[PDB]
Design a protein around this motif. Structure first.
Motif, PDB file in Angstrom:
ATOM      1  N   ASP A   1       0.841  -1.209   0.000  1.00  0.00           N
ATOM      2  CA  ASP A   1       0.000   0.000   0.000  1.00  0.00           C
ATOM      3  C   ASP A   1       0.861   1.238   0.000  1.00  0.00           C
ATOM      4  O   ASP A   1       1.973   1.236   0.526  1.00  0.00           O
ATOM      5  CB  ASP A   1      -0.986   0.085   1.167  1.00  0.00           C
ATOM      6  CG  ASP A   1      -0.280  -0.208   2.472  1.00  0.00           C
ATOM      7  OD1 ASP A   1       0.313  -1.302   2.559  1.00  0.00           O
ATOM      8  OD2 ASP A   1      -0.271   0.638   3.384  1.00  0.00           O
ATOM      9  N   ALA A   2       0.339   2.276  -0.640  1.00  0.00           N
ATOM     10  CA  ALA A   2       1.138   3.440  -0.983  1.00  0.00           C
ATOM     11  C   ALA A   2       0.323   4.679  -1.302  1.00  0.00           C
ATOM     12  O   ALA A   2       0.849   5.774  -1.175  1.00  0.00           O
ATOM     13  CB  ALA A   2       1.998   3.163  -2.205  1.00  0.00           C
ATOM     14  N   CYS A   3      -0.907   4.542  -1.792  1.00  0.00           N
ATOM     15  CA  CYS A   3      -1.713   5.703  -2.158  1.00  0.00           C
ATOM     16  C   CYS A   3      -1.675   6.763  -1.068  1.00  0.00           C
ATOM     17  O   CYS A   3      -1.096   7.827  -1.238  1.00  0.00           O
ATOM     18  CB  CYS A   3      -3.141   5.261  -2.432  1.00  0.00           C
ATOM     19  SG  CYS A   3      -4.310   6.600  -2.684  1.00  0.00           S
ATOM     20  N   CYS A  15       0.288  11.215  -5.232  1.00  0.00           N
ATOM     21  CA  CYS A  15      -1.035  10.602  -5.269  1.00  0.00           C
ATOM     22  C   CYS A  15      -1.388  10.317  -6.719  1.00  0.00           C
ATOM     23  O   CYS A  15      -1.951   9.270  -7.013  1.00  0.00           O
ATOM     24  CB  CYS A  15      -2.096  11.583  -4.753  1.00  0.00           C
ATOM     25  SG  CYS A  15      -2.060  12.050  -3.020  1.00  0.00           S
ATOM     26  N   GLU A  16      -1.088  11.249  -7.624  1.00  0.00           N
ATOM     27  CA  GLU A  16      -1.429  11.080  -9.023  1.00  0.00           C
ATOM     28  C   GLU A  16      -0.818   9.792  -9.589  1.00  0.00           C
ATOM     29  O   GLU A  16      -1.518   8.980 -10.188  1.00  0.00           O
ATOM     30  CB  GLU A  16      -1.030  12.333  -9.812  1.00  0.00           C
ATOM     31  CG  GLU A  16      -1.981  12.540 -10.992  1.00  0.00           C
ATOM     32  CD  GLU A  16      -1.656  13.819 -11.712  1.00  0.00           C
ATOM     33  OE1 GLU A  16      -2.120  14.873 -11.243  1.00  0.00           O
ATOM     34  OE2 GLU A  16      -0.895  13.756 -12.698  1.00  0.00           O
ATOM     35  N   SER A  17       0.484   9.591  -9.406  1.00  0.00           N
ATOM     36  CA  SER A  17       1.182   8.414  -9.904  1.00  0.00           C
ATOM     37  C   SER A  17       0.680   7.147  -9.211  1.00  0.00           C
ATOM     38  O   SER A  17       0.466   6.114  -9.852  1.00  0.00           O
ATOM     39  CB  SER A  17       2.690   8.601  -9.718  1.00  0.00           C
ATOM     40  OG  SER A  17       3.017   8.997  -8.399  1.00  0.00           O
ATOM     41  N   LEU A  18       0.496   7.218  -7.897  1.00  0.00           N
ATOM     42  CA  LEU A  18       0.138   6.059  -7.106  1.00  0.00           C
ATOM     43  C   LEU A  18      -1.313   5.688  -7.357  1.00  0.00           C
ATOM     44  O   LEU A  18      -1.629   4.626  -7.894  1.00  0.00           O
ATOM     45  CB  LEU A  18       0.270   6.360  -5.608  1.00  0.00           C
ATOM     46  CG  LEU A  18       1.528   5.892  -4.887  1.00  0.00           C
ATOM     47  CD1 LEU A  18       1.809   4.409  -5.170  1.00  0.00           C
ATOM     48  CD2 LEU A  18       2.821   6.650  -5.156  1.00  0.00           C
ATOM     49  N   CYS A  19      -2.201   6.559  -6.914  1.00  0.00           N
ATOM     50  CA  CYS A  19      -3.576   6.216  -6.656  1.00  0.00           C
ATOM     51  C   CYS A  19      -4.255   6.298  -8.005  1.00  0.00           C
ATOM     52  O   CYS A  19      -3.902   7.157  -8.819  1.00  0.00           O
ATOM     53  CB  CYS A  19      -4.242   7.263  -5.764  1.00  0.00           C
ATOM     54  SG  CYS A  19      -3.481   7.756  -4.205  1.00  0.00           S
ATOM     55  N   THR A  20      -5.196   5.412  -8.282  1.00  0.00           N
ATOM     56  CA  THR A  20      -5.760   5.309  -9.616  1.00  0.00           C
ATOM     57  C   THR A  20      -6.443   6.611 -10.027  1.00  0.00           C
ATOM     58  O   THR A  20      -5.788   7.374 -10.733  1.00  0.00           O
ATOM     59  CB  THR A  20      -6.585   4.038  -9.760  1.00  0.00           C
ATOM     60  OG1 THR A  20      -5.721   2.933  -9.545  1.00  0.00           O
ATOM     61  CG2 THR A  20      -7.159   3.950 -11.166  1.00  0.00           C
TER      62      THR A  20
END
Length: 40
Positions: A1-3, A15-20
């Motif tokens: 987990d990372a978002c 957040c942009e790169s991580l979270c969908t």
């Protein structure tokens, strides 16, 4: 987990790169967007 971890790092792009998008981002991004400068 990372978002959420992205938002910890205080980087909108994290957040942009991580979270969908369309919730995942929102929770993360909203944090930065109310915690990190230049927003706070």
């Amino acid at each position: 987990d990372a978002c959420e971890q992205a938002a910890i790092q205080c980087v909108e792009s994290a957040c942009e790169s991580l979270c969908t998008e369309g919730e995942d981002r929102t929770g993360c991004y909203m944090y930065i967007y109310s915690n990190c400068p230049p927003y706070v």
